Amino acid sequence: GSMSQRLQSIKDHLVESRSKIEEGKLVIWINGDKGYNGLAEVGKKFEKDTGIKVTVEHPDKLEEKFPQVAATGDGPDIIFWAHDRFGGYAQSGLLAEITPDKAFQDKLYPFTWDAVRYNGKLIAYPIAVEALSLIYNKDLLPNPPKTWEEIPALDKELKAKGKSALMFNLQEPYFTWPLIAADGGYAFKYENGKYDIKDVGVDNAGAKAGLTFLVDLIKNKHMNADTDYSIAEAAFNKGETAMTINGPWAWSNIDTSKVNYGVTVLPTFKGQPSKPFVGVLSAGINAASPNKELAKEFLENYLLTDEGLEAVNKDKPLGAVALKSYEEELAKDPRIAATMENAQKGEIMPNIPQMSAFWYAVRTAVINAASGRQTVDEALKDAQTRITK
């Protein structure tokens, strides 16, 4: 009744405030949009071989709960998230330095290890690799353009036919940055294991050249400044535009649309590749875990194997992966091959807090230049200033 209700509350405050990670088992946190049931299957195999119970959970806001709980010594032994959040966790000392040997490191793509480095230490195992690609309608456009420069002429042909060459999200700088970066734009200069928050590449000549090209497409009516994520997705999936720019999260909708599509390398600009930001799904070990050796065994010898990644992938696709052997297996799908190709040609998403300052400023600059509210030069100058204030 009333007494037991009140005592249950007291009990819960006491139990939950005293509890720590349990020794001799593994608790894993991973996002709800990942193949957590497939991961749990890897967990079952690990338990069969070792007698170590593996519990996979997908709590809401796990990326916010982890930094808050980690100091208590409770929470997960292993956390899976995009690498860029791990910078902040590492700064707060919440992640154990991992110890894969040289031979193990050779089993993953070299660039992926850089995504999981902070202050000279490896702080997580790379799992998956995600980046934007060029998506094209095979019926409208069997041979998509290799260069951005070819788009105006292509659009002229397609507009006559009542279609368009290219529609993609112009509102979010994540989508426009690959072009802006191509000829020299960058967020922060990386030197000596560290991003220099005072060296920003937003108003340099390369960024100006890229955004000017974007704005000229708009001025020449090859694109529309108002085009956003939904407008572009609808247009492509309805067969109205020959190309879009998007990531592997968009593929299932295109599958449903029955549009005959391909996924390929992004067009070059001034002979240089478009450089999309790369997100690396990564597995970190809690610095407070009493099970660090068990976690290492699980990650290296069970998960990061063809068998381990297959189990996760068949639950929900991982996209491209950091493990060379399994990437080669997946890459017979040209969509996966393109994802990895664009990722290798792009840049790792910086893992520092100042990226939010970058995104906010660049978002405004691109919207203003595209809409004719500012010139390209003024828009980028103001953004550069705001970031470096």
Partner: protein, 336 residues
Amino acid sequence: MLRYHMQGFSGYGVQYSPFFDNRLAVAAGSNFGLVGNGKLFILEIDRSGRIVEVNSFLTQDCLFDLAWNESHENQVLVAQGDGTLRLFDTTFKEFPIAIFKEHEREVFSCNWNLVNRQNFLSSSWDGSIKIWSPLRKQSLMTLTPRPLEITKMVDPLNAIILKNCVYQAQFSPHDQNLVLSCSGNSYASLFDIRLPSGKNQNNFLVHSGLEALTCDFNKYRPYVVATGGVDNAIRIWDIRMSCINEIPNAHGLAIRKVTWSPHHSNILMSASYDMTCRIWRDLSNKTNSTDATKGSIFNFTQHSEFVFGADWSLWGKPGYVASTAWDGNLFVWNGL
């Protein structure tokens, strides 16, 4: 240290009178607040330092908090386990002058508006916060914490498929229309009562997914709040931005109370199930996580059971505090 013992009762809340420099009140309950009577103690400290009971009121059920009437020197409100709040005039005996009956479960907190000085607030296990006038039987407004992440993942027909608690709420002492609360779902809620229901609240995750038990506005900095809870951490937030400072492992067990000093913008006090009361310096006003002592100023360890109530002295030598606990003790001491 100055002391007073409440025989068989456990202290849940304590507050100094805003009118009488030597007067305070304690809300208490029998059997550690789990079952039986509640009791409101009205206490006086004399010249010598002896604490004396000058009045008290036995209630039907345990008392979980109190709030002095900021507009009337003789009136004090209590929050009761039966879902009522009761307003007492300390001149009288035995009974209250008003009963406020709308909450469906235990009322865990009540606080008086320091800006208008007219209205008061309550928060309940029933999941709601109510704003009241002491002159009116019915509440003026009801606020229900509903975090966006919580709301989205909870099934709309949840209440009919068989498979929360608002521990504290406070009026801003800066803005008449702002209310802050903490819930068992680990979210702090910020209400602007000028906006309509369903569009009047911002929510943020404060205590790891574990229950958030306590929240308090900085007395000098309008946008600065502190929270405490079951993850043993004190967090300091900027609501116009959100974590500006953190004190991880501030205590060994859950933190039941945090309260900012009314003398300094950078000083706060915490009370805990680890049976201590601690004084902290907010180093961001640098962070406490990086400092060798985590900005710890003083550790009061005299209580022998869970510490549930703590309040800063308003007048006199700055740094005096009253604490009360499940040991039946009220202590008055200087934390510096």
